Amino acid sequence: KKFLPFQQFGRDIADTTDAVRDPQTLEILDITPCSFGGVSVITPGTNTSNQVAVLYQGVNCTEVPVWRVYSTGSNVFQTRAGCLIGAEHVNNSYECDIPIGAGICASYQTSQSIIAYTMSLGAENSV
Amino acid sequence: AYSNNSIAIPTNFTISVTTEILPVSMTKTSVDCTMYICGDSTECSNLLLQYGSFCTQLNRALTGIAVEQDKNTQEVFAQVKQIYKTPPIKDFGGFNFSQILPDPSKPSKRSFIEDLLFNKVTLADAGFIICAQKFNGLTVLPPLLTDEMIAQYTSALLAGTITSGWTFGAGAALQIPFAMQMAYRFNGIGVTQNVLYENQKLIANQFNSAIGKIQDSLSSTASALGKLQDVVNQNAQALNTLVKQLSSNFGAISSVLNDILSRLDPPEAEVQIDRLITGRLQSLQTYVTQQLIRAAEIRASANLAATKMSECVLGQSKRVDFCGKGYHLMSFPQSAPHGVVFLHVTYVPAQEKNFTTAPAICHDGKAHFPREGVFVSNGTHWFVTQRNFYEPQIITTDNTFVSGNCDVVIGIVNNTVYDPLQPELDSF
Amino acid sequence: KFNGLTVLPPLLTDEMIAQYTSALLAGTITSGWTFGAGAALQIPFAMQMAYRFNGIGVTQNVLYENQKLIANQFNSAIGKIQDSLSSTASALGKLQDV
Amino acid sequence: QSLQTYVTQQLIRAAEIRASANLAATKMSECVLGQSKRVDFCGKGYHLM
Amino acid sequence: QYGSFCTQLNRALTGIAVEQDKNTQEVFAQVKQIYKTPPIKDFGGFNFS
Ligand SMILES: *[C@@H]1O[C@H](CO)[C@@H](O[C@H]2O[C@H](CO)[C@@H](O)[C@H](O)[C@@H]2O)[C@H](O)[C@H]1NC(C)=O
Ligand SMILES: *[C@@H]1O[C@H](CO)[C@@H](O)[C@H](O)[C@H]1NC(C)=O
Ligand SMILES: *[C@@H]1O[C@H](CO)[C@@H](O)[C@H](O)[C@H]1NC(C)=O
Ligand SMILES: *[C@@H]1O[C@H](CO)[C@@H](O)[C@H](O)[C@H]1NC(C)=O
Ligand SMILES: *[C@@H]1O[C@H](CO)[C@@H](O)[C@H](O)[C@H]1NC(C)=O
Ligand SMILES: *[C@@H]1O[C@H](CO)[C@@H](O)[C@H](O)[C@H]1NC(C)=O
Ligand SMILES: *[C@@H]1O[C@H](CO)[C@@H](O)[C@H](O)[C@H]1NC(C)=O
Ligand SMILES: *[C@@H]1O[C@H](CO)[C@@H](O)[C@H](O)[C@H]1NC(C)=O
């Protein structure tokens, strides 16, 4: 950004500062808030198993760690909805069971495990 | 020009295509309560803990709305359990569907008109719907069905409709040539079917021209999609004012929590922080209430759209003005950002004339009524025609039926009814 | 109106709504249902009622031979409606409540 | 606070009235400008006009 | 010092006020011309007076 000589700060549409000028050396710094989001637990009923998967939504999981075991446990799979931990990626496509989002569903199947796949709209047919 | 022995009957027709636009869903959004009200300040949180479960109620409400949106979309679009596809040969009897069928020459397999619709909608704010996170505890969630799956559903519906008729909505798709399907569609609105087979390419040309004019009217005019645009506008505006309410005083000393904390003692900063948290809580509640009301409106619109998809597309409707103005023939769907667009194809008459009429005909002391049609006279002779297209025929005993004598009907005329068996017996 | 409680007048007066309604009535009784699909086409009234009868499943035969009976019944029903409105006041509740 | 309560209730009432208006428009389109087969939509019996 | 509460209230009430006119227009204005009946009331024996 190209400040004028007499300007110091920089503001946004909603009046939130997003750029500053270093007082000692005259340069421009852009400010970005560090990440946040909610945590989601994907589980089949406790009647079936005590195993779960965790979704950190809206976070690029190059920095997930910051219970910890489900922070580097058995995988870190990146999806458009966030980082999924504890579930294994398959290549088949079935009907949706538990909706995760952005086109990704998850289910519990085979020695059992939790799988995440891309939902399928239906069979193909040519008339 | 009313009168009690005068009727007007059309002589030509016109095929018209019109558009209808409906919203279906809106943006899912979630809000963090403790971070919005006062973030990074522990002292404030201990004060906030004295109000109980307000934040939980807010979160539950927003989650309910978020789920209902995906429910709406699935109700509207997912009405077929197979994915049909059109054959590679395009012998459709003269009609030209090239402008609504998919185009595999694109990263997303959308048709021409869908591309126009997706380019007309513009959003003023940037990055308010891979990053999605707002300044203060505000987040937007992605929908469950990408924009590339909805296009597949629409393509399946179109292919099924143009290859199988209305039989794929009641069971298993059964194929049928397009010309015969259109003949049945005319038969459904009271016009004999030999009116199509003898006027086929005229109808094809009219249909093609109508589609062309639709393309122009979409690509030139700008204010077609207002209904879809104002939804985005309202959502952006509400979010904007929410964020903007963080720079007010509400009666306290300053709007920055750190300045109140770092200028007073804890026995006085409390009386200021309380005012601040009260104001911000009130703002949040106002936001969620307005969102609930808007969600109700959108749900009503989505239900209407689902009904139209069920009855105009998968069949042929008799309800007047439900599926466009005129006599309904058929309809086609298209997708658009946050909504759906229907193209209705309908029938309108033209070139009416003047004839004199009568309710019955006393032939031989017997009253003859028309089986299906109406009696007309061109000035000297009497014919019997169908009610929706001028086509006269001789009056015989096969298209009329007898009931009683002819001294009770008001306005009965004399004329001869020719008997087909009479010459077969006389020439014999 | 004392602290800011203003009320605005409607865009369509009560003398335009009546004219719209009269237009609808005249179209209906002079042209049938044809004016809701295109240009209005005229047809005698008795024949239009014959078409409607044929629509509900009864032969048109039945109307032409009982025309004046039906006319009398229709007129009497209209008269009864007029009396019932002119007598009782609790008929329009759903409006008054608003 | 009083104003807020008032406007909220007015919004809800307006939604109700809009629903009623849509129903009236549909009745005008279907019962008047045509002849209906939907049962009990335009009165009890077989509809004539 | 309370922010933008009054603008919100005014905006809501104005929205309702416009919606009313939309309702009335949608219900009644479904015809394109203004028809009228002839002066000779020969309607087959019925009465619409
Ligand atoms: C339609 O009904 C009217 C209703 O009154 C009848 O004509 C009346 O005309 C006056 C009142 O306007 C009254 O003194 C007469 O005795 C009639 O009842 C009539 O049944 C019919 N109108 C016509 C013109 O036939
Ligand atoms: C799916 O198959 C492709 C090959 O077509 C392969 O590259 C990819 O790794 C597979 N995905 C998984 C999750 O095994
Ligand atoms: C309508 O019927 C009456 C009844 O006899 C008749 O006098 C009149 O001529 C008819 N209409 C016309 C335009 O002739
Ligand atoms: C019907 O209209 C078309 C043009 O729209 C015209 O070519 C045709 O001749 C008309 N029908 C008759 C019978 O003239
Ligand atoms: C359908 O219309 C397009 C648009 O002009 C045209 O290019 C195409 O050739 C038409 N279809 C056929 C089979 O000619
Ligand atoms: C039928 O005759 C009337 C009486 O003159 C006339 O006004 C009307 O225009 C005629 N119909 C048509 C379609 O021209
Ligand atoms: C139509 O009317 C004219 C006028 O006299 C008549 O000559 C002709 O025969 C009538 N139409 C037919 C098919 O006869
Ligand atoms: C022909 O119709 C007239 C009515 O204008 C009627 O008086 C006459 O009796 C009818 N013909 C015969 C042979 O009766």
Short mmCIF file of C-alpha atoms and ligand atoms in Angstrom, two decimals, chain A residues 77 89-91, ligand 2:
data_model
loop_
_atom_site.label_atom_id
_atom_site.label_comp_id
_atom_site.label_asym_id
_atom_site.label_seq_id
_atom_site.Cartn_x
_atom_site.Cartn_y
_atom_site.Cartn_z
CA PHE A 77 -6.69 -34.81 5.88
CA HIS A 89 -9.90 -41.18 2.81
CA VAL A 90 -11.38 -43.69 0.37
CA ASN A 91 -11.89 -43.35 -3.38
C1 LIG F 2 -7.85 -42.45 -6.08
O1 LIG F 2 -7.31 -42.92 -7.32
C2 LIG F 2 -6.35 -42.03 -7.91
C3 LIG F 2 -5.99 -42.61 -9.26
O2 LIG F 2 -7.02 -42.41 -10.21
C4 LIG F 2 -5.15 -41.89 -6.98
O3 LIG F 2 -4.22 -40.97 -7.54
C5 LIG F 2 -5.62 -41.39 -5.62
O4 LIG F 2 -4.52 -41.38 -4.71
C6 LIG F 2 -6.72 -42.29 -5.06
N1 LIG F 2 -7.22 -41.76 -3.81
C7 LIG F 2 -7.17 -42.43 -2.65
C8 LIG F 2 -7.73 -41.72 -1.45
O5 LIG F 2 -6.68 -43.55 -2.57
#
